[model samples]
Target chain A: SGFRKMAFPSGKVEGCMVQVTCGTTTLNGLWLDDVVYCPRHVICTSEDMLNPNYEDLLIRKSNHNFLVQAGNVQLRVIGHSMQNCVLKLKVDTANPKTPKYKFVRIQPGQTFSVLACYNGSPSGVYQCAMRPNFTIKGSFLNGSCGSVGFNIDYDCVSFCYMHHMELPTGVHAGTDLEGNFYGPFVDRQTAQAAGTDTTITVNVLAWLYAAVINGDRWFLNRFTTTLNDFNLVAMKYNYEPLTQDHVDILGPLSAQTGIAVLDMCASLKELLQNGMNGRTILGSALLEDEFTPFDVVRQCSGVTF
Target chain B: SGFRKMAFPSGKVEGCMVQVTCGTTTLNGLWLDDVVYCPRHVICTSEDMLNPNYEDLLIRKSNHNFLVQAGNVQLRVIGHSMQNCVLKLKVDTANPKTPKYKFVRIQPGQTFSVLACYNGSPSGVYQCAMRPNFTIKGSFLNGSCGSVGFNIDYDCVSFCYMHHMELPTGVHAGTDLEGNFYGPFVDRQTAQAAGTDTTITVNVLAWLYAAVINGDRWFLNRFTTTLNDFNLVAMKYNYEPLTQDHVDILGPLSAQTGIAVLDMCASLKELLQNGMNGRTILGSALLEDEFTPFDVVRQC
Candidate 1:
């Protein structure tokens, strides 16, 4: 029977030694052959030396030197290259606690980047490993410090990137309607009846108050706008529609600008004109942050699930 | 008779000279006396020297250095002064364009200050006079260099300042009986019934979704007061006396500390409690800056 000795390279160092000792079993035997400490080291674990079907070997402590048993040795990379770099370790298909990664070919003076995956669900100790050019070290605390590496464990949540869109000019133009200025007027009396021989004044007065508050969709055309803008809107309704009943309720519009009068027609016109003196009207007054009805309709139509 | 000649001393410079002239009518022309001027000065009209009232004479410019008769002389003062002094200028008061003084007095620093009065409503321009010392320099715009004075033409507006008071301990003790918070909740329900309550729902929902918003008052009280001082206020109606409903429709009080809850009582309690959890029982809510039952009251 011959003694099996594992040889290690001494490189350029002068003195070297191979020491071996026998024990009760091969498992407890200390073995080394024709080896010396060198700058460059080759490492192998129990799985690499004893197991024939070893898919991967984990290197935990530093300064491990050994001789590989031919083709069974497979190098696996772990950890990340830089801080903030995404590190994803797919350790096992059956279990997620173990880390794993895709193999990357790194050339001299070249850089490689990868996405990182982390389970911040629970806080604890974690580590990753690297292969082949096995001169790397990694841990959740120290991160991956090697030519081929992964990122450290830190607290982070999943993120999503999205694109926001603006309203198109054509869409805005498609629903645009022209509006104008009308009056400063008063409604002195209310119509009390409707039907045959019934006065329309009652209906007009009720509608006038409602319009002041609710506004007419046909004339409001754009949006609820502001009280000042609504004043202009009321004026436009008075001018454009020109309903005899409306005129009867609102009185008459005045041409004079800035004329202060007690008459409802003049008062309404003057207040509206003053409000419109320097303002642009659009959108809902109750909430200023909304699109016009036309744009809202188009937007709703364009919404996709 | 002698002429009126006043001496004025300019304290800024040593031996500065001053002179005064008196006027006369057809009786005595005019005269200059006790006057100091450049040696080349000459007196063209010395008629007033013959009049006994030369000291009270009025001097007017007829030609260059000559004089003519007008009326009794008027003197005025102007300019800032620190020392006690006065300025005097002779003018014809009968003329509309001429300036006039209502009264004169020594101001803050014992300095002579002039007051000018106006007739009816007018602008803010007035004539003034000043005096330096025993040596009176009666000219326009001459007074003590640093003295506080008032504009004779301007006056302050007449008005009174109002005092405000804080609410006493039990003032708003009966807010619930008056239906103060009822209307908003009712309106909210009505809007919700109509399916037009989206806006209010969004606002109330967002506020309720965050626990920090409702718990802040407790946090604030924690820092502001000592442990034994426990000061806390909640969404429940305060039963203070001042908040009691003077209006009978809201109902009568059950107890002194505003313990009574009237019709629609259950809904109001639910609304307030919901507010504690940052939730809105009333879909929409409206609150006014000023709280009072009388404010919402209308004459029948």
Candidate 2:
């Protein structure tokens, strides 16, 4: 694999053409993190990216798109097979944080639903109910392992608060709907009123956070989506949603592609995401056992029951 | 500690006396398991017992007593200190089982309490709430880490269904209120009522099991203080609680005494039992670290 080329079977069908677009090609044309994008079919792998050049590189193969993070970007993928594969990012916003996903988080007790379509027609619908603990085990799969993009909605609040936060985690001097206030700015703010009007700040996670967390949904139009210029702008900012929210967050999605590989050894979060494919179907912990107990292995282990 | 004898101060007062009872401990003298019991005071330690004489030994001193396991008894104690300390037993049901305890388990919705007595009188009281999962974190220690034994009552039924229990794990032939029955016996059985009657077998754990499980405490009298012939009888059987309940159980008690030592580097169950002593106050996991990771550390 490290530079020795392997032979393919003779008499095999010559595959589709490969497109390379390092400077310009984008996911549906919306530029994201500084990435070298090439038209692609794809694949996934397990390697921490220490992108020296800080460039996210995605090569689209006709069937599957492989990703590459040459230590310069936050993420990287190599198309070992150039296989035709689909991308299914996990949407979770409650328990842990994963940046690369179409996630949502509704306030407690709220619900979100999605009507999925297959082959240009209606497929089925699904919804997730947020438990008291603010976690959702439900999803839009409706009982399947994969799905194309679908529309989603919930008790959404179209609120956006922007501030060039310095030392982002403490209370800040800012103004809310109730003017002239000095307090914290979190997903939501509760204000005390000296007289009548109580000051409060309503904050919302970006579309990704909304879709991942249970109840509240973030509203946005299509990607490659005609009516929305943001379909592109959103891509660039997808990595920085709620830059100012006081909630705990691990900004910029993980360097790993949030796709489920039935055969890839992964972490708990990874398995939870791929429940679309039977969670049990993922690679064995035995694979993890084969590796020495190092940091990455410990962090990426699927051994926990 | 192996063969050499150490010296002690013998100046002025000449210290209190030491008593060694090999053939008879009577922990109230019930004549339970065989052991060398010399009493007056006590202590705890951490070594597996591979008794050579097949005897349970106990020696008591004045301020504190050290124990030794010479590999001859189900339990062993050598008078390392000859110390006279108090006996603090943890009574827990609904969690791990320790054969050496005053534990009890009340059915999930039921309750059990204790009225502890100090020098010949009442001390304080305590009770436990069993969670839906059938575990109790409560004990008779009002707030301290130790207590003198006390009396207890529960929603206990006088029911005992006995069989040689060949296999002890599958369905068995037995009789209930209705008639003859063939079914498995666990902590409880859900009998299907047919026609006019339901054959329900209300199985109860022997006192030891009852005390260890969460719900339905068993009834018993004083250990060494009263008119019960069974205080000793109970001691021998304490090792064999609910031998018939299909529920999961580790037979006999673990060879270790359930008395938790504040400096004990124990497991989760041990910490839970010694909460009265401030579970955090126990010995460190570092103690576990001091030993090489081996089999006795793993199993016994």
Candidate 3:
């Protein structure tokens, strides 16, 4: 049996010692024949090495290196520099040529979060590097020091989940022509846990009004595309289709009622074109004994009270 | 009998003797208190007049005034200025505060035309003044010397006639749900003369396509409003509605056919999401044996 001795290159003046490996064996030091030799890892000046209890002091001083954490859709950088430094974060794909870049100036002991993706989609694998060069306090670190790099792969499914969790119950229950639900509803428990039922109701009404008045093609297309994807995700997760009770509570009123609402809207537009008295007529129509909010909602979206 | 002589303002130097009249009597000269007095209406220099045989010469040299003519929609100005001058023409409506103006530099013997109305609508009675100003050239004439003004009322009827004459036969024939035609047809002879039948067909198809795809409320409203106006004008002119045969040839195919076209457009949009192969499929769909242009037009 031979004693394995590893060797490490010396004169690593201002940087941390990254463990080097060859095949199955880690070469923290150098190996020659059966004897192992190691150079003293130096993070700073050699004067600190004279103290036998210098490890604790070095550990405290080593806090000056940056701490980086990559979350689902954001990058958090904690400044541990001795002074303020202009930190540049570059996000690059596996291909070295294409890179998206951002910069932030941070004082010592400050933290900053950067959004990695704006639209809810997979942002791909982002290879990020943070460099703290010159301090805002007018001091320059050596070119090779105070830098950290990492890789983060954002999950597109989590983005979809986040959006689904935020949507209204009615939107989740609405079905396209193919009988597939419009937006994702993983479970009643998850939706209840999110506690956005009231918010969803208000937003659904607003969305319907906008769709009818603006006839925005982008909105319609996006809604349809997302619903198609939602159904796919639901199938993958083994979630049941929205039940009849869910539809009764949340789905838009019947197609006949939708047509009636459209007719009413057209008539209202014509009346408004006549004069200011049109608003009075509309108000009276709303306040009439037969006219109710439930009735209006029933006509607009087939959702029952 | 009285010899009616008119006194002219002096420095009326090299200009034509514009005849004036109060009732039927010629006012080339003037009648004062039943006694007629006259001034020689020279229209030229007194030196030229001194020559017993200078009548022809005076006629040749007496070209120092402007001639104005107003036509259907344009104004023509004939320049008779002895030297080049900037001609400023201002057209004011019945309300004199706001005026539409145009200016042109005309040489001694040239003609220029100005648009009476820039916008399509009928411009009302335009009170116009033509002024021949100094060309940055030397010499100055008094305010009344180089200025001529007149009133021209552009016939509103001609404006209506021009727009009425331009519309297509099909546009004039296609009736709305109220049985009112869309635009004024006027007569068969006019429609045949305009030759916009094929053009109208192409544009109508394109318009229908846009309406179905975009669900354009404004286009639908405008079409309906114009049809209402068309019916009113047709009633005033005593034109009959389109015949059944005319409807069969030009009318949009049935409502069922319209829905089919919308469905086709929606399907095409969905197919486009699949990328390059989608175009190939669309091309093949168009080229298939069953897909005739008439059939495609029928369905889509």
Candidate 4:
């Protein structure tokens, strides 16, 4: 709301330049010798400033640089004190301060203020869901006119998209903000040795041959997607470095977490050591009994190896 | 790698003083005309400087502020030329150069050299994850001695935090360098009104509830939580103003881009007016819908 007029009627006149914000629009005005000289709004008439009776729309005594509202017109005045001067309503266009990005872990019913993708779309400040459920709600203030401001109000959990690991080379394999597990892909070095021209990707199901059951360090590597998968086997014991490793992915598996890593030493060992077949080799499970992560290629474009 | 001793037999001498580092430990020394001056590795007798016959370990030239790994000793020389003066490496310990706290929306994948929080932790340089996906990784490098060679690695995207918007109040909410959402409660607004003795601490979640489909212009008055619930009901339509409203909550929502908001005129209208049961009032999906929101509190 824009102000048609405003008048300052305090004891002290001739102060300094004052900035007035009526609604979103901000304007400048002067306080000279018992009168407000405003070109935009007819701040004061000759009699209005001199005689100065009531009839003035709003009159704040000595302290109102804060916030004032009359009908649709929201007013904010800055710089009336001699203590410190005020300038324009400053918006921080300086250096952009982003939020922390990652699949953060918190207890049930916890909300964090993160600058994350708004439902995998634009990123901004969101009061999102942690444990006990999944919800990513966006929040913005007039002071900061930002955020994509989306909402996911279903009240459900989603291990639903259980796709196998289907990512490309130079990318790691794991779950995402949306908790859909991916066996994601096979070993890097060993994949190149076997498939050669092609390569590898794991699924959350494949690792159930006892992948996570073995240990933590999932040796992700930069290997050629070729034939003779020997090195992929060596990576399981994984004395290898972690230029291609992720700590989050290196975590243990479970139904509570819904994951399945490969047990290379037991099942897949013979595939390379001697010959290969559908000889059901056994492995462990974070979910001992009822567990089968159906490997589906949801968004296969980016995840395909 | 620590250096024992070496020879500078190529050209000039007395090239001012020099500092050397021998892996773990560090020491200081000098160079005087044709000859060399040192103590640690005995350097060489004055005779070794004068005659300087065969097998003089290694020969080096034209380098200041450069590394010379001739032997196991990783000899890093400094100040061989006035131009190679090692200046101070101080990080700006201030907040954003603009205002103290306000969000900046920049394009994704843009990496500005920032000596900021490493791994959502301490203040240092990190090649963080932006856009496409997110992860503020801690990728440090060794410069001079320690590991804070500020490097914002990979392709960056600036869906950076508004953790961006620092609301104006007596106290502030808590969100960090990490994209972790917080319920961060706002303290003591209730101390002024009816909640004189009793109180309220609205979290990020309840505020989300306040966004419940009623409408965006929620003035959030003190309609009292006790008997009448007048403030909350009256809060929906007329009287009060959204003096305490946040704009982000006012946006249209849906799937793809998930959220829920107030469906004021619709839901509460049914409840208060006709006293209808909880019916399915569908809302937007993926930022592509046309209607007002019908606010529903999820976890409650």
Candidate 5:
């Protein structure tokens, strides 16, 4: 399905400045005052936030720098909280690994002067986190839109990151919110904090779009049919060498537990290399019986069971 | 386990033969006496009364020709009474082709003799019926010490025509209780006369004596172990064009159910040809998966 688009009116209204609140969360406690967001929205906020100054920065007059059309976007994590407010942005047609404009710290209610970088590739989950005692907040934006009215941060959190786009083979350098270029990192936080043991794994399923005509409402909606449409895209299992073997075990376990294993490109490619079919792939192909070696045993104990 | 030998008390007093009686009233009573005996004994009595007046047949008198062991054991079928008497027997050394003597009838107080032919094979299970009117009583004699004293006249219809002695495939002449040498007439009885619609299929899985002992005990004991130890003897699947395919499906089903398909001996010659390591006989090998089609499917 196409990325979900959302917009809301920030309480702090400014000139030629508007906010597109794709995720469910409010700014400065002014909006909602106290209203809990839904679970899916909460998960997205907590996972995407970069800087924790949700009220001050988000509602600041100068920080509103976006240009989206038809307002289609997604909220993704880009970096962690620090002195320099780092934010990776994905707008209509502009996505820069390292943009020339550096975001300066904003004063209370003093919105920063933000410019829209409209480029075809400027699509990423924008995340931010406050420095010193780090706190985070994040939201979705489209560089294509000139500016939009947005608010509502009920389920907002203190950190943010982006879902890694599936790449071909070679490494590609790109900056996250922190303006750091690390090949294939989930976002700026992952690339910058690579050496540390800190890592986050989230459960996700894929989706597909369906075209439907409802009177005047010609909408493209998520198919939402069966397990086949829900493809899983995991971070820890895919990137961590120690945890990669879990991909094999998890595939069959999920399928056996009534979760369909869609050929979502990631797990399917892994199975194809082993000279196995989809049935075997979803039926614990990597796990050995009397005829084959157990996948975990080979990686962990260096022996076959 | 050792062989379970059931003994028949050989005495002159004509002791009562107690059985583990099973069956409903109609079928049970028919198997006991009315149908299986009334005619055979009448014929024997008629032949006796034509000669002597008041003398036992075994008196060694001039007309004492009923030797109590000769004559064809004919089942006197007097209407539906013979329908009830069906007996399940675990025949020793089962020989399907040419059975020596067939079982006639069984009663609680009937006199029968066991003859050991010096030049012939001795024992096997005889699938006997008593004129369909009497249900045969089965006294499971588990050797000398323990004997199950009950009569079962119910649905115990199947019997194993076993031989007590090692019988070669041949027609052997034998005398009945009446001292008459009755030549072998085919097998024990026709499949129909024995109340069987068709020949029951047989699937044999031959394994080494040691393998059966050491492997899965419950499966081996439940499916393969018979009272007469036919498992130990070398045998082949009685082949028929149509029934041969049934073995394929049955063997695999048995294996899926965790039954063992033994591969101790590959051929009959491996068993009888060499005779247990030194054997070189035609029917002396254990059925193996590679050599036999039934074993092939079962092992898979």
Candidate 6:
């Protein structure tokens, strides 16, 4: 089903912005804002906003940045209210002559992901905004389209430092929404210290996208753990881990990725036991003698076995 | 499954005859008796000449004669005991060298029918003797096999008298063990008065057999009701119909046939509603033109 475009009666206009408040945390942003304005950075407005009805109209933004691959933009919007709500995506803000958009309704405590192609020129900007439809209690969060260039590179060696090599194999593996290039540090201080490097975030996202495209769960889990652990470790180091700012930054990526990794591991183990028998294994062409463990490591980083 | 031959020990021979008693009525008859002995006429023997235990071995004889069509003898042995009992049929007493026989275990209140070919010379004398097992309480009566010849003509017109021509066409038609030849009689006196004609009895049996072979329940019910009504009307007319002699003759044919007729009527009514229709009626080649009530009666 295609997204529904919100149409208003004559003399009435669609809300241009939404102010989202959950607990003590509040966020406001422009609706269908332009992506050229650094859509990812402008997802939320500063707390000093003048809107007094911020609590009534809320949009909760995702902590993870939008990753545009092959001209495709993808991002998640979390519903932060006690009930369900809808998020609208108005694509191609750069050209009003031929505009396109989509909308998604998400339930409270749920997240909705959008994967769509860029409608205008690659350099053109696109922004999305949400309005509160009082019928659903969950609040909305504004988001903007961003691009992750196709030729991006990642530094796996640097992100691997968070593994704490002295720890047991498989013990310190962690993952998160930032694509697992950063820390699942042994302590919050280690995570905060590493979080300072913006390069770490970008490189991890690049690595994560590569692993996802390759359908490599082992690599995905390891890298995901690296970022998730960094967030958790940082939260702990900050002492007041549950603070609104901390939550807005970390969200629940650590917990969600932890489940994804475990699930992937279990399914892979089942497949190995039931499906990968000697006959099936022998039926496939033998690998060339040139194949080595390093070749495997390149595809699935930190997978020692 | 065919009949099984019973093997008896030296001192424990199977009973030669049966003496059956149900309530106050009792019947005696030979078991596996030869058809050549004019079986129906010799079915019962005088009580004055039997052993002191004669009452303990009664074999109830069927009022309907054994119709030995093409030398095939068919008869029924009803077990009247309160518990299960066994009846042994020793076939061909005249040919001991190759004597053949069968044993039937019958549940109390159940009837077992026997169909067998006559053995040895066609006109030869044959007799079967049965020894009592002395287990069940009910006694047995002796019966002799008899034959009703083929090509027997029936007076359907005479027996149709009880139908009363003035009565509605289908309403008064009835049947029984005697087939459509006799009855739907008005009462018992009329039946006995008519029953005196032995030809009626034989023709009645022939008609009954034909109806049964043709699977004609309509004809069967009509005639069965005729004979049943005869016996019941006789019982009521005689008033002393429960007498041992009276029961020995009438037994329960009327009662049994009454039930059979009622069952057939019910099933026929069901068939009329669900099975018969104008299209189905017209489809049959036997009914050449637009169907009428007569066509229905003829087909169904």
TM-score for each of the candidates: 0.15, 0.16, 0.13, 0.18, 0.18, 0.13
Model 3 chain A weakest 10-residue run by lDDT = A1-10
True contacts kept of 5: 0.00
lDDT of each: 0.18, 0.20, 0.21, 0.23, 0.21, 0.21
Q: Distance (Å) between predicted and true CA of A257, model 4?
A: 21
The global Cα lDDT (0 to 1) of model 6 is 0.21
> Against the true two-chain complex, what DockQ does each candidate achieve?
0.00, 0.01, 0.00, 0.01, 0.00, 0.00
Error of 2 at B265 (Å): 44
lDDT of 6 by residue, B206-287 (tens): 2232233323343223322333544454343221111233223322332434434333333333332343332221112111
Q: Write the per-residue lDDT of candidate 4 for residues A1-305, one digit (tens) a residue.
A: 00000011110111122334433433332222222222211223334434432223225323243232212333344333220111122121211212112222332222222221111111122122222212222222212111111111122111111111212221122222232222323212124211111112122223332323323233222233211343465354321212122122323332323332232223234433443232222221111111112111101111100
Q: Report the error of model 1 at residue B263, Å.
A: 19
- Candidate 1 yields a Cα-based lDDT of 0.18
Q: Which tens-of-lDDT digit does each residue in A90-160 have in candidate 2?
A: 11112111113232223322332222222112222222222223222222211111111111112111111
Candidate 5 lDDT tens digits, B1-300: 110111121110011111111111011011222211111111123244344222242233221221111112222221321111122212121222221222332321211222111111111111111111111222111111001111112212111111111112111211222222222222122221112111112322322221232232322222332312333343333321123333344454445444533322222223334433422111222221111222222122
Scoring only the second chain, what is candidate 3's TM-score? 0.16
Task: In model 1, state the lDDT of residue A133.
Answer: 24
lDDT accuracy of residue A111 in candidate 2: 31
TM-score, cand. 3 vs. native: 0.13
Show where candidate 4 strays beyond 4 Å. Answer: A1-305, B1-251, B254-300
Candidate 2 docking DockQ: 0.01
Candidate 2 Cα errors over 4 Å, as ranges: A1-269, A276-305, B1-55, B60-62, B66-105, B108-300
Off by over 4 Å in 5: A1-305, B1-269, B272-274, B278-300
